[PDB]
Amino acid sequence: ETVPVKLKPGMDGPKVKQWPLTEEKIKALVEICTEMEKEGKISKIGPENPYNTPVFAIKKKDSTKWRKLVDFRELNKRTQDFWIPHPAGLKKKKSVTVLDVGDAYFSVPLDEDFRKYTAFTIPSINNETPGIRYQYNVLPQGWKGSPAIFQSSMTKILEPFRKQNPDIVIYQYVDDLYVGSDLEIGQHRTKIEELRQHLLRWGPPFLWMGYELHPDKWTVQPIVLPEKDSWTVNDIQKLVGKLNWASQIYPGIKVRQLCKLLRGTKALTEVIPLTEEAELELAENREILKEPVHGVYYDPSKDLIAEIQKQGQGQWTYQIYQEPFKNLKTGKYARTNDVKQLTEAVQKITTESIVIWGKTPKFKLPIQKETWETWWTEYWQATWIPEWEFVNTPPLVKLWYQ
Amino acid sequence: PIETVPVKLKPGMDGPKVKQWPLTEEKIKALVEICTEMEKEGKISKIGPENPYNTPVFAKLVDFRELNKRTQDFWEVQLGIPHPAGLKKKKSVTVLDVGDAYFSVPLDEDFRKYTAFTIPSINNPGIRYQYNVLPQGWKGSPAIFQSSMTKILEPFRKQNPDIVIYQYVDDLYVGSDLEIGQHRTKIEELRQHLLRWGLTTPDKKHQKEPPFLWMGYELHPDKWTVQPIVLPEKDSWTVNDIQKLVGKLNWASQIYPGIKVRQLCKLLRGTKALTEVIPLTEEAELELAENREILKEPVHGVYYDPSKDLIAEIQKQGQGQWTYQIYQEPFKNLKTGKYARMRGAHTNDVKQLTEAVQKITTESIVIWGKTPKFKLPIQKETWETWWTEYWQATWIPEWEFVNTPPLVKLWYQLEKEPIVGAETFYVDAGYVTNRGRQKVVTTNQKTELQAIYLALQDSGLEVNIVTDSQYALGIIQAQPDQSESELVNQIIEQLIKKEKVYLAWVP
Ligand SMILES: Cc1ccnc2c1NC(=O)c1cccnc1N2C1CC1
């Protein structure tokens, strides 16, 4: 018996364009949806329904099968807020394994009146045919309403493990379950596997292969300065420039003595032995950058933004902040091709974002829409889909990182 | 008979209440004969004065503007249309015209009351009716009908996986690979399946026959093309004539390789009226003539054979001009094309070619559901070098180097480190070198590039250049080889001339 869900006051349903798919993905999607229909999970629909959400087919890790990913982003934004908070202990756990508990949803009917909004279409190659249309009858994987609406039923099947094993921290985000602990990596994989049957046996593949995140070992990428034998006019110029930038963050940084070794229009390559004042000013500056600036705090009421930079050689740098210059985190990602790496980046970065603050970030990606639209689904494996926009990375910002 | 589709008016809106315009007794006459034949066939039915809604009727036409404004939205009629190059060849293709499309499809019982209209009396009331079927001119008719059509077909389709059917508004294209007689048999089999649903189709001798002119294309069951374009032979051309010409020239490029419009396009520069006459340039008539020529010889697109690979080949036609063709069997084109898109005021052929690959790729997924293997005039080394050093993420699928000049290359490369014993110019419009030299010779941004240019001019084959302009830095670091700006192009000329150049930025 179903709970009523509604769209935020005055809002209408999603009418999102479906991005063209490959015959491969389409065949998979047909194979899939045909069996979801046979099980009454979805139903075909008519002209009177004008809504639409985009679907994609992604691959599972060590599964022969394909997963159906519905981009419920637009819908999620139009869905009523529901009235689980985030465990800041989870980020301290040693090992966190991630499970896909999405299938649980397929056992809960969805309020008949809301269904029409879950509409999606299965395109056909070259517009040769109409295009198969469906709507969900149960709770769909990916929609923010689903976890909320299943919360109760969830807490119940999880109160026994949660008390028979309260050394385990368990967090649920949409189709995902984050299981934390401090146990030995061996004791973990076992306690994990028991939960699997304790869920199966209480009516689940894990994500990220069969792996553990190790949040306990996530650190900030402090800003670094070149440490070198002799310094040329170029080196110093590069140094001052970098320092000058970082001073808007760490105002204690001084360049006075460095700028001085630079008076005169000297040859770029000319080696400049550093004075005592200079050398000790750099020392201080170096000391300052050793840690993240103080004062930055996570505001739950603000958006979590994440920009990525291409460094080269399979190396990327990213930062997570809410207010420019005020990073909440910074990292690096290294090994394929550009796109694959950028996607593995985005996903890796979303997971942490989820583990640390329990919310996904808004990415700024250094790539053209069309290229991304085209290849992302190829290497994507997450059940969620962050939001994202596309930008033009300044050559100076790349320079100032890594 | 056929399932009814539930319709509703937009939220918080009432049915239409618009007054019937005054009508001619002669016109009242005809409407009543028409609306009586229609009530005998069930399409409509007299209603009582219970119904307060009304739609305008004129001579039979029913104006549904109002009701339409008030009716809900339906799912998109014909999102997109297939492109002939994505079809698989057929021995036979039969087009089935469908008359009374809407009139044989029932309308939601609870909606009919909104389709009410009135036939005025001649003597000082007028008859009142409502529709029981899909009215021509109504918002949802097209969709409810496509959808319905689809349902009727499904069976026939499951029993004839061989036949292929495409629904196009009121047409129906039916192909197969059946022996001549067999095909005609199936067709007539289909025609009855539609009759069992009051749907009427043309008899074999009244059916249109191949090729079929469709959306600017000319279609056979085995080969395609675009409907024959004739190039005018005027001696006086109007801005308008040139626009249309370019327009049409353009459309042809999807199959006719070699079509160029650059010179003709150049003719619209500065024009002040659609009727202004522009005389043709020497290069412009040379271009027209060349096209007129290429056109004279008809060329046929070939259909898709899914058992074979898709090959994509790209060539540089001119500065910023690209041509490509996709085929499965050498020169046996499924489709050709051009790309002139310049993203950003500056670029290099490497970046541009990549964008071409992307457009082609996208297009292919749309037409064939897969990407082609590319044959490109650039070597992996060249590609890799630029990719490896460009700030933006990029990717190019399976591609094979093709030695077909012109090959795309990088005309220059910035040293990654300052140069030893190469003079150092400091620029901010003027410079000051370390060796004493100087010259103090426009928008803010354009004054910057001016300096750099100066320095490049007066320097030797190796140079180190320091600037505070993060802008110019950006520009030049992207190593463009072509630009909208003339200044840049001169700089680029310099750049290509040098042996080693090192550019650096300082606050
Ligand atoms: C206009 C159109 C749109 C989509 N497909 C087709 C057609 N028309 C054809 O004439 C055609 C030609 C060759 C192969 N399929 C074709 N047909 C298929 C239906 C038999």
CA distance A98 to A355: 10
Q: Which domain holds residue B348?
A: 305-411
**Which CATH number fits the domain that encloses residue B64?**
3.10.10.10
Give φ, ψ of A333 to 5 degrees.
-140, 125
B4 & B122 share domain: yes
Given its phi and psi angles, is residue B334 left (phi above 0), alpha (psi -120 to 50 degrees) or beta?
A: alpha
CA distance B462 to B138: 74
CA distance A133 to A52: 9
Alpha carbon of B248 to ligand 1 centroid (Å): 23
A200 & A98 share domain: yes
Q: What is the DSSP letter of B138?
A: -
Does a structural domain hold residue B18? yes
Does a structural domain hold residue B320? yes
Residue B142 Cβ inside 6 Å of ligand 1? The answer reads no
CA distance A335 to A342: 10
Does a structural domain hold residue B452? yes
The amino acid present at A273, given as its one-letter code, is: P
Distances in Å between the Cα of A120 and the Cα atoms of A76, A110, B368 are: 14, 16, 22
- Please, are residues B128 and B46 in contact by the beta-carbon 8 Å criterion? yes
Question: What determination technique applies here?
Answer: X-ray
Neighbours of B217 (CB within 10 A): 19
Alpha carbon of B211 to ligand 1 centroid (Å): 10
A155 & A288 share domain: no
Contact A232 B418 (CB under 8 A): yes
A233 & A314 share domain: no
Does a structural domain hold residue B357? yes
A253 & A195 share domain: no
Cα–Cα nearest to B94, from B250, B203, B233 = B203
Which residues of B sit in the known binding site for Mg(2+)? Answer: 97, 170-171, 428, 448, 468
Does a structural domain hold residue B180? yes
* Among the partner residues B87, B358, B474, nearest to A370 by beta-carbon distance: B358
A97 & A191 share domain: yes
Atom of ligand 1 nearest to the CA of B211: 10
B86 & B169 share domain: yes
Backbone discontinuities in chain B, residue before each (C to N > 2.5 A): 59, 124, 428, 441
Alpha helices, DSSP H, located in A65-207: 73-78, 112-115, 145-164, 185-200
Give the Cα-Cα-Cα angle A110, A111, A117 (nearest 5 degrees). Answer: 85
Resolution (A): 2.6
Give φ, ψ of B333 to 5 degrees.
-60, 140
CA distance B217 to A230: 71
Distances in Å between the Cα of B79 and the Cα atoms of A124, B169, B188, B314, B469 are: 11, 12, 30, 30, 48
Pull the structure tokens for residue A75: 């819908």
DSSP letter for each residue of A291-358: SPPS-----TTS--EEEEEEEETTEEEEEEEEETTEEEEEEEEE---HHHHHHHHHHHHHHHHHHHHS
A206 & A307 share domain: no
Give the Cα-Cα-Cα angle A85, A88, A92 (nearest 5 degrees). Answer: 145
DSSP letter for each residue of A21-53: --HHHHHHHHHHHHHHHHTTSEEE--TT---BB
Choose the final residue of a domain: A276, A298, A320. A298
B334 & B250 share domain: no
B251 & B277 share domain: yes
Pull the structure tokens for residue B62: 């029913």
Alpha carbon of A129 to ligand 1 centroid (Å): 12
Alpha carbon of B112 to ligand 1 centroid (Å): 37
Backbone CA torsion sign across A227, A230, A233, A234 = negative
Which residues of B sit in the known binding site? Answer: 97, 170-171, 428, 448, 468
Distances in Å between the Cα of B49 and the Cα atoms of A97, B38, B53, B118, B331 are: 70, 20, 10, 11, 71
B285 & B314 share domain: no
* Among the partner residues A265, A341, A393, nearest to B426 by beta-carbon distance: A265
B206 & B292 share domain: no
A191 & A227 share domain: no
Considering its fold, how many domains does chain A have in total?
Answer: 4
Question: Nearest CA of chain B to the CA of A266: how many Å?
Answer: 5
**Which CATH number fits the domain that encloses residue B460?**
3.30.420.10
A279 & A326 share domain: no
Cα–Cα nearest to B491, from B466, B441, B455 = B455
A126 & A179 share domain: no
Residue B377 Cβ inside 6 Å of ligand 1? The answer reads no
A191 & A141 share domain: no
A47 & A177 share domain: no
Residue B465 Cβ inside 6 Å of ligand 1? The answer reads no
Choose the final residue of a domain: A146, A173, A197. A146
B428 & B486 share domain: yes
B32 & B127 share domain: yes
B195 & B227 share domain: no
Give per-residue burial for B444-462: e unless 16+ CB within 10 Å, then b.
Answer: eeeebbbbbbbbbeebeeb
Does a structural domain hold residue B507? no
Does a structural domain hold residue B331? yes
Does a structural domain hold residue B234? yes
Q: What is the DSSP letter of B339?
A: E
Q: Which domain holds residue A239?
A: 213-298
B98 & B111 share domain: no
CA distance A377 to B368: 18
Contact A48 B6 (CB under 8 A): yes
A324 & A192 share domain: no
**Which CATH number fits the domain that encloses residue A271?**
3.30.70.270
Name the closest residue on chain A to residue B469, using Cα atoms: A396
Considering its fold, how many domains does chain B have in total?
Answer: 5
Alpha carbon of B224 to ligand 1 centroid (Å): 10
Beta bridge partners, B50, equal none
* Among the partner residues B5, B81, B166, nearest to A48 by beta-carbon distance: B5
**Sheet with strand B373-376: strands edge to edge:** B332-339, B321-329, B311-318, B373-376, B399-401
Pull the structure tokens for residue A346: 């985005």
**Which CATH number fits the domain that encloses residue B230?**
3.30.70.270
Name the closest residue on chain A to residue B173, using Cα atoms: A128
B17 & B91 share domain: no
- Please, are residues A194 and A304 in contact by the beta-carbon 8 Å criterion? no
Dihedral of the alpha carbons of A347, A348, A353, A358, in degrees to the nearest 10: 70
Pull the structure tokens for residue A155: 């807490």
Name chain B contacts of A265, Cβ cutoff 8 Å: 424, 426, 432-434
Contact A126 B361 (CB under 8 A): no
B26 & B53 share domain: yes
Q: By three-state DSSP, how is residue B501 classified? A: strand
CA distance B207 to B94: 8
**Sheet with strand A169-173: strands edge to edge:** A169-173, A176-181, A95-100, A206-213
Residue B84 Cβ inside 6 Å of ligand 1? The answer reads no
Do strands B482-483 and A132-136 pair parallel, antiparallel, or not at all (unpaired)? unpaired
Give φ, ψ of A67 to 5 degrees.
-105, 145
Backbone CA torsion sign across B366, B371, B373, B375 = positive
Which of B145, B370, B394 to mutate to probe the A interface, most A CBs <10 Å?
B394
